[PDB]
Structures are given as C-alpha cells and as structure tokens.
Structure 1
Amino acid sequence: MRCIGISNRDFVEGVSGGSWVDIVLEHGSCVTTMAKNKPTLDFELIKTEAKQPATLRKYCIEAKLTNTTTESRCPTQGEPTLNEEQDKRFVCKHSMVDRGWGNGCGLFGKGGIVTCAMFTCKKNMEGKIVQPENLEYTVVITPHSGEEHAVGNDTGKHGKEVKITPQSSITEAELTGYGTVTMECSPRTGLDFNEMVLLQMKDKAWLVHRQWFLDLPLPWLPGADTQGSNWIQKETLVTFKNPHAKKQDVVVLGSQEGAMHTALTGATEIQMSSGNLLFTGHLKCRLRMDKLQLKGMSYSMCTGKFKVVKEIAETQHGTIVIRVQYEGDGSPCKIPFEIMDLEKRHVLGRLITVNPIVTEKDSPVNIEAEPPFGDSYIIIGVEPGQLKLNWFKK
C-alpha cells in the first residue's frame, strides 16, 4: 500500500489466466500489481547503485601556480635552461626579451628566456565508466495488507527489500505470509553505457558522452593515476604573457566549476548520495506469482458490523481508500466489501486491495477499491448494520 498517494502510480493486472505479469519501474514511479486470486502488491524501485565504476580520467578544474622561477641568456648565448623544465609538476615556456647594457649584456638584441611555475591542482572532476552488468537495483515490495499504518507509509518497515542484478539470474521474493513471488529482471537503461561517462563534482553528478568528456580542454590525469601531480595539458589553465619583451608572466585561469555546470545544461543530471544514486532507467521485470497465495482463504466472512475509522478519500487516480474498524466478535475473519450500483442490484466496482480481512478487534483495516465513474455504493459488512456509504467518481 506504499503506492497509495503517489502521483506516478501505474496499475498492472495479470494476463487473464497466466499468473505472470510484466511491470516497469523507475525512480519516482510506483506500480500496483493485481492478479486473479492473488494478493495485490506494490512495487517501487528504491535505489540503483553502480558497484564500483572505473575512473576513466580526472580533470583539474581549478589550480594554483607557485614556486615560479626563470632563466635567461644574453643575445648569442644559446637558450636558457631550468631544471624544472623537466619536473612534470612544473609548466614552462621559452620566450625572448630585449637585452643590452642597461640590463646585463654587452650586446643589444633579443635574448632568450624560459619561465616555469609549479602547478598544483585544487579541485578536480572525475569522469567514470559504469557497466550495466554490475548495477544492483534495490526494490521494495509492499503487499496490500490493509494494515493500519500501511497506506502511503514509506518507512520500508512494511515491504520486503529485494536486491537485484542482471548478472544474477532470476531473484526470488519471500513475502512473509503470502508465500513467494519471483522477479525476472533485465537491464534496459536509457542510453548506452559505453558512449556515456559518469561525471562527478563533489555532489552534482551527470552522465555525458564519452567523447565530449575526453575533449574537455582541461588539465588531466589518466584514471590509473595515484600521483596526482603530473597533470597533462597543464597549459589549458596557464597563460604566458610577454607584451613588451621585458619579462614573461605565468597566470592561472581560475576555477572552471561553474563553467562546467553551465556546459552541463543539456546533460543528464543524476542525484547521488556518496554512492547511492537515483538514475533514469526503465527497469523491466517479469512477475511469476505461482508460489504466491491469498492470505486466509480459510477464514469466514465476518458477521458483525464495521465503523468507518477514516472517511473515504479519493486518490489522484480515481481509486478510493477507506479505513474501518470491526466491532463484531468474529475475530480473524474476512470483510464483506462490494461496490454495488445505485439500487444495490448489480456490482460496479472492484477491490484494489483484494481480499480484506480483520485480524484484531482493535486494529483498523485499510481498503482501496476502484469504484466506477459516477455514482455507486460502497457496501461494507453484512445485514445487521451494513454500511452503505454512497460515492461519486471523477
């Protein structure tokens, strides 16, 4: 009954005869499955967690230049040389400056120069690759127990959590009391997982095109990196200025954080809490309910009368939910429940929460029925005090 109250709720019914039903889940969605002489169940896909992707690459989006040093030579004295010219943490550039008496040389002319500054990354992205094979989809199955606090309760303490993997065959489900049901799940994500890379920025984390990712004009380190200093293309964030041949300067290009966001507009976002993300993927599964069995078809209809505990409420999908309490002595019994017509002649509606049964003189029961459009009557209980609440749909 977890679905009762969710906007994006899909109702799925069993193939007339065959106790097999196909459903589709996706974060922000809910599915209420029904099947002849079978408990009504609610399925929701909690989380979709990639186990441990691989760091394809690692871009630096903000750096600091330090320990700047420079070497120069007089005209006709060959190129300058700096040891740092070989230190992978340093970024260097050769250039030329005017030289003459006024500044150390006996000759006037363009003299060679070379400047180096130590590049230290301050913040970095981290593109990653995920393989559908290793995607553990968690799914919570909440049966329409009718339990007092079940309606819309998203605690989890009402359904049975089930872990699933495409590379884990067909998984089984133990529904404490109803038996067992089995799910035949297959990946079937939105976009390809090879052409797409999982980019991450301390919190916001998208999913972009492999190529676009790699073409990013930013200092980077190959995934297999551990050093975290020998950045490739350090100059994509470093600029060398020598305007009047006097001196040469090295500058930082400042944080690219926002620029990345600004460029990840069309990209596919993906909320994620340090490892448990909430993707976008139609996770299809097949349901076998052969081992599933109604609860207590060994009980007898109740004879006593019921007291509406919580007034009939209509859901965003035309269904109605009502809560009632049993006052009869019957003890563990079934609740009479029909959606008759205006004259109590025929039947016009169906129970969504199939086979309603009281379990304790003092535990109210929640029932979700689906009345027709227009009028109908919700007839609950039997003759002595039979509630005959009227209703109008859509």
Structure 2
Amino acid sequence: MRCIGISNRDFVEGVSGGSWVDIVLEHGSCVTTMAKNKPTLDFELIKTEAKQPATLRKYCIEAKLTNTTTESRCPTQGEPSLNEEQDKRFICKHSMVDRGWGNGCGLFGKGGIVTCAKFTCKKNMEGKIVQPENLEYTIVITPHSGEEHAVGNDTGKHGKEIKITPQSSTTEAELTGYGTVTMECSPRTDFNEMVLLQMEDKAWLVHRQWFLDLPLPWLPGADTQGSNWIQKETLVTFKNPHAKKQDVVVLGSQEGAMHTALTGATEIQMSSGNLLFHLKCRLRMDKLQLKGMSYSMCTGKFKIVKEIAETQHGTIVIRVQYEGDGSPCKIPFEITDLEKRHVLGRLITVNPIVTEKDSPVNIEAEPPFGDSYIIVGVEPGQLKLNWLRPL
C-alpha cells in the first residue's frame, strides 16, 4: 500500500493462472502487482549498496603551495641544494639566473637556483572499486491488507524487507498470512570495470580506464598517510622567463572542471556507502494465497473513517471501520452504474477483509470514467457513496 501516493507507479497485472510475473524495480519508483485469486502486492527498491569496496586511487583537485624557499649560488660556486629535495611533501626545481656584481657575485654569469614549496591538498576525490559480486539490493514487499496505517507508509514496518545478493539471486520470503513469494532478480543498468567516483556529497559511476588516466596528483588506495602525492607536477608550474627569478604557481581548483567532465556520466545519489541509484525481477505467485478467500461475508454496518481520496492515477482510496460482529469477515464491495445494475471498475486491494472491529481498513479501487456508486457493505447501513471520474 506504499505505492499509494507515489506518482512514478506501475500497475503490473499477470495473466491469471501464470506462476510468474515480470517487474522492473528502480529508485523513486513503486510497483503494484495483481493476478486473479492472488493478493495485490506493492514493491519498492529501498537501497542499493556496495559491501566493502576497495579505494582504487584518491586524486587531488585543489591544492595549496606554502613554505616557498629558494637557494642560489654565484657562478662557479657549484649547484645549490635544500633538504626539501629529500622531503617528499615538497616539489622542487633547479634553474639558472643571471648573476654578477649588482646582485652579489664577483663574476658575471649563470648562477644556479633551486626553488621548493610545500604541496598541501585542499580537496580530493576517492574512486572505490566495485565488483558486481559485493553489490546488495534492498526490496520492500507490502501486501494490500487494508492495514489502517499501510497507505503510503514510508517507515516500512508494514512490509517484509528482502536482500537480493548476486550470490543468493533466488529469495523466498514468507509473507505473514499470504504464503511465500519467490523472487528471482537480475542485475541491470556492467560494474566489473567500473569505478564509483565520490566527490563531496556528489558521486557517480565511471569507467576504470577513464578514471585511472586523469592528469591530476594521486595516491594509491592503500595510502592512509596522505602527505606526499604522485604527479604534483599536474597542478604545479615553475616560471623563469627572464633569468631574474624562479616563480612557483598552483594551477587552480579542478572541482567544477571535473563536474563538467562528468556530465555524460551515470550520476548516483550517495549517502554513507549507500547508492540511491533498473533491477529486473520475476515473481513466483503459485505459493501466494488470498488471506480470507474462505471467510464469510460481513453482515454488519460500516463507518467512514477517511473520506474518498483520489490518487494521481485516477484510483480512489477509502478508510472504513466495521461495526458488526462476524469478524474475521470479507467486507462486501462494489462499484456500479448510477442505476445499480452494472458492475463497473476493479478492486486494487482485492478480497478486503476485517481482522478486528477496532482496526479500520483501507481499500483502493479503480472507479469507471464518469458517474458510479461505491457500495461498501450490505443492507441495512449499506454505504452508497457517489463518484465522478471525468475524461
């Protein structure tokens, strides 16, 4: 009954008798499944998750150069040196400047220079290794049991949670009162050669080869030191145009640059390892059964707890409380023409039943286009509601 309220919803009906039905579950999408003399079920894909992914490589996208230090030598005085050359946190370059009398040298010539600066990463991006094997799916199956709260109940408590693993693709969940439903799901979108690149609160799924060939400073997955970066040269530039001085320049944030490069790519919503992303399944309904197909018809009177409300798909919802005594019993329900002669429209919440008089029931039905009578219960106290469904 979760689907009631969700705009991206499909009403999949299986050719009655058939022991299977094919559905496509995805994020932000709900599915309602029906079959003759079988219970109506609601399916949602709650979460997609990677179980322990290996950090392939971490790249620096924004850097900072500090501690700029220069050692020079007069012509003929040798090559200059700093310890920073040994220190891996620094990026160094040797060059030549014009030396002579007016800048401290007894001789006139090309005096050797050396400049070192501290490479500090400010923003970086991990790309975690995904294998289709360690990819888990979380499906919620909610039967149409009229349960008082069930209507668009986001919490989940009402439905049976199920995990689809590529190691355990076939799962048989026992639905309390309806029997078992075997679910056979197939992973679709390759994930073998795919890196799940994580930026900030933004993340995507990208090619292994594309990732690995980025012109940026990087660190191997294994590294948790985070001090000295491979390829600093990709963000650092040394300038000496007039042999007067050597200038060290940062290449500017690559954050927005990256977002633009990632336009064509598969964007995914991410939060604490979970990717809220086209998972195609087969449903075995042979082992499913209607709760109450052998219960007798309610004879009592019914009260209207929640007024008829129309869903975005033309369907209607009614919440009613039983005031009789026969419970557990089948609630009588009918949609007829104004002249109460023709049976019209269909019932989504098939075989509506009362379990307890105290607990109200929610019924979803598809009214016909135009005027109809929604008749819930039996005479006396028979509820005769009127509906309009314009074209």
Shorter chain as denominator, the TM-score bin is over 0.9
Q: CA deviation at 1:313?
A: 1.4
CA distance in 2, matches of 1:16, 1:38: 9
Task: Tell me if structure 1 keeps the 8 A contact 2:346–2:367.
Answer: yes
CA deviations 1:137-180 (Å, max 9, x no partner) are 00111111101111111111111111111221301212112121
Match of 2:233, SS state, is: helix
Paired position in structure 2 for 1:363: 359
Q: CA deviation at 1:76?
A: 4.3
CA deviations 1:182-232 (Å, max 9, x no partner) are 11011012xx32454211123111223334333332111122333323311
CA distance in 2, matches of 1:4, 1:311: 15
Q: CA deviation at 1:72?
A: 2.7
**Paired residue total:** 389
Paired position in structure 1 for 2:258: 260
Task: Tell me if structure 1 keeps the 8 A contact 2:80–2:112.
Answer: yes
CA deviations 1:348-368 (Å, max 9, x no partner) are 221100010112222211100
Task: Tell me if structure 2 keeps the 8 A contact 1:129–1:193.
Answer: no
CA distance in 2, matches of 1:218, 1:144: 54
Give the strand-richer structure, 1 or 2: 2
- Compute the TM-score of the two structures, normalised by the length of structure 1: 0.92
Match of 1:128, SS state, is: strand
CA deviations 1:46-89 (Å, max 9, x no partner) are 00011122222110122232343333333345543444334332
Q: CA deviation at 1:346?
A: 2.9
Task: Tell me if structure 1 keeps the 8 A contact 2:132–2:192.
Answer: no
Q: CA deviation at 1:242?
A: 2.1
Match of 1:295, SS state, is: coil
CA distance in 2, matches of 1:262, 1:285: 35
- Show the 5 A alignment for 1:290-329: 290-329=286-325
CA distance in 2, matches of 1:297, 1:194: 48
Task: Tell me if structure 2 keeps the 8 A contact 1:196–1:209.
Answer: yes
Mean Cα displacement is larger for which, 321-330 or 210-219? 210-219
Mean Cα displacement is larger for which, 315-324 or 340-349? 340-349
Q: CA deviation at 1:93?
A: 1.3
Task: Tell me if structure 2 keeps the 8 A contact 1:19–1:35.
Answer: no
Q: CA deviation at 1:120?
A: 2.5
CA distance in 1, matches of 2:14, 2:260: 47
Mean Cα displacement is larger for which, 67-76 or 161-170? 67-76
Task: Tell me if structure 2 keeps the 8 A contact 1:172–1:180.
Answer: yes
Task: Tell me if structure 1 keeps the 8 A contact 2:41–2:142.
Answer: yes
Paired position in structure 1 for 2:91: 91
Mean Cα displacement is larger for which, 352-361 or 76-85? 76-85
Q: Structure 1: which 4+ aligned runs deviate by more than 6 Å?
A: none
Q: CA deviation at 1:15?
A: 2.5
Paired position in structure 1 for 2:350: 354
CA deviations 1:307-345 (Å, max 9, x no partner) are 222221111112111111212222221111122233222
CA distance in 1, matches of 2:174, 2:18: 20
List gaps (5 residues or longer) in structure 2.
Answer: none
Match of 2:54, SS state, is: coil
Task: Tell me if structure 2 keeps the 8 A contact 1:34–1:41.
Answer: yes
Mean Cα displacement is larger for which, 153-162 or 376-385? 376-385
Match of 1:126, SS state, is: strand
- Compute the TM-score of the two structures, normalised by the length of structure 2: 0.93
- Show the 5 A alignment for 1:1-394: 1-77=1-77, 79-189=79-189, 192-279=190-277, 282-393=278-389
Q: CA deviation at 1:300?
A: 0.6
Match of 1:156, SS state, is: coil
CA distance in 1, matches of 2:5, 2:262: 34
Mean Cα displacement is larger for which, 111-120 or 311-320? 111-120
Match of 2:126, SS state, is: coil
Cα distance change, pair 73–194 in 1 and its aligned pair in 2 (3 A): farther
CA distance in 1, matches of 2:228, 2:305: 70
Query: Sequence identity of aligned pairs in percent?
Result: 97
Q: CA deviation at 1:262?
A: 4.1
Task: Tell me if structure 2 keeps the 8 A contact 1:13–1:33.
Answer: yes
CA deviations 1:269-299 (Å, max 9, x no partner) are 22211112201xx101111122221112232
Alignment RMSD (CA, Å): 2.0
CA deviations 1:245-266 (Å, max 9, x no partner) are 2221223234333333344344
Task: Tell me if structure 1 keeps the 8 A contact 2:13–2:33.
Answer: yes
CA distance in 2, matches of 1:385, 1:68: 90
Q: CA deviation at 1:12?
A: 1.1
CA distance in 2, matches of 1:356, 1:33: 16
CA distance in 1, matches of 2:185, 2:382: 45
Q: CA deviation at 1:241?
A: 2.1
Task: Tell me if structure 1 keeps the 8 A contact 2:3–2:32.
Answer: yes
Task: Tell me if structure 1 keeps the 8 A contact 2:71–2:82.
Answer: yes
List gaps (5 residues or longer) in structure 1.
Answer: none
Mean Cα displacement is larger for which, 297-306 or 5-14? 297-306
Q: CA deviation at 1:132?
A: 1.9
CA distance in 2, matches of 1:390, 1:68: 82
Match of 1:213, SS state, is: helix
Task: Tell me if structure 1 keeps the 8 A contact 2:169–2:186.
Answer: no
